[PDB]
Design a protein around this ligand. Structure first.
Ligand SMILES: c1nc(N2CCCC3(CCNCC3)C2)c2nc[nH]c2n1
Lengths: 18, 340
């Protein structure tokens, strides 16, 4: 599932500005 | 109806310009505050829970190292942040109570919002139901209507920059990328997941980037994950520039319709950017149950009330490594931050 793909990603924590 | 909004906005611009042209400066001193705990640390600097001894009030004090701001090329952005924040006044915008500087640092003392970040609640719960996301979305729609009427571009919308107050309402807390600009602007800034295609494509852009970021926020709140994500920012950009979005099967037809109009690559078609302006959003079917005045007046019952043990309680925030505030005997970057 998309939720399972998101949760396993490295981008679930606080995201830094660019 | 929109005449009352026009009148409201005209008096709001009058109040803003007086403060914009004549900014409050040096309104307190570091020694007036008792430093309690770090609430957060990042590119925004360090934010600490503080107690004002003369009143006993608690506040959130942002500390910025002047030398770090210089090395990071954030001088003008930091001057924009403070100039705008001290000038604005809206129910969903955090209040700047005091600002001052010393030899080493810049300080912004803001109202303490004890409910914690929307980000924390959103990740733990997984996702918000549509009525829950709509309640928060409505507050941002009014906030952007207020900001854009003052010629301000926000550029830093994300759950990590929205706090929940004791009454369950939103407080927008991050003005680091805010800018007063009448024409177009070109700075590459914001967060990968929230960037409009025109920012990624190095075009001159305008307030339409905030309406795109609202589309991103509504999707993430209702789905539990953003519309464009990948392990690397280059892969996120590739997804944003391609004109494709997929919605969870639980998304209502009204929600998908609103999100196709907000997450519109074509600027002549993006909601918030047309002849009817913000009314294309306010009058959309997904917002039919929203009473805009009741939201502004804070009369609507919030879907969620954060846990509040007492004054100074920090349970809604994560723990951070504490560092001592070191003030040099020598004034750093005096000229650069002269107007702060
Ligand atoms: C409580 N906490 C705050 N912060 C602690 C969490 C991280 C923040 C900076 C990054 N964006 C969200 C708020 C600053 C506040 N910043 C202003 N008022 C606040 N009240």
């Amino acid at each position: 599932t998309t939720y399972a793909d998101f949760i396993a990603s490295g981008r679930t924590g606080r995201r830094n500005a660019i | 109806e929109q005449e009352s909004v026009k009148e409201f906005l005209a008096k709001a611009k009058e109040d803003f310009l007086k403060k914009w042209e004549n900014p409050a400066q040096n309104t307190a001193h570091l020694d007036q505050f008792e430093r309690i705990k770090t609430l957060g640390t990042g590119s925004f600097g360090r934010v600490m829970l503080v107690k004002h001894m003369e009143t006993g009030n608690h506040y959130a004090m942002k500390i910025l190292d002047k030398q770090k701001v210089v090395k990071l090329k954030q001088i003008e952005h930091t001057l924009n942040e403070k100039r705008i924040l001290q000038a604005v006044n809206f129910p969903f915008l955090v209040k700047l109570e005091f600002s001052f500087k010393d030899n080493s640092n810049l300080y912004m003392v803001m109202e303490y919002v004890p409910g914690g970040e929307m980000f924390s609640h959103l990740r733990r719960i997984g996702r918000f139901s549509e009525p829950h996301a709509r309640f928060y979305a409505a507050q941002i729609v009014l906030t952007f209507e207020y900001l854009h009427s003052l010629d301000l571009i926000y550029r830093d919308l994300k759950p990590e920059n929205l706090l929940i107050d004791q009454q369950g309402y939103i407080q927008v807390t991050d003005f680091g990328f805010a800018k007063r600009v009448k024409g177009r602007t070109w700075t590459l800034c914001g967060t990968p997941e929230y960037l409009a295609p025109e920012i990624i494509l190095s075009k001159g852009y305008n307030k339409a980037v905030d309406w795109w970021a609202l589309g991103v926020l509504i999707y993430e709140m209702a789905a539990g994950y953003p519309p464009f994500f990948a392990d690397q920012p280059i892969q996120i950009y590739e997804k944003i520039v391609s004109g494709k979005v997929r919605f969870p099967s639980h998304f209502s037809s009204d929600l998908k319709d609103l999100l196709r109009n907000l997450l519109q690559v074509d600027l002549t078609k993006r909601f918030g950017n047309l002849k009817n302006g913000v009314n294309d959003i306010k009058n959309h079917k997904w917002f039919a149950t929203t009473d805009w005045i009741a939201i502004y007046q804070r009369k609507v019952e919030a879907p969620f009330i954060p846990k509040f043990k007492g004054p100074g309680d920090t349970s809604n925030f994560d723990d951070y490594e504490e560092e001592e505030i070191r003030v040099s005997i020598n004034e750093k970057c005096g000229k650069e931050f002269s107007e702060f």
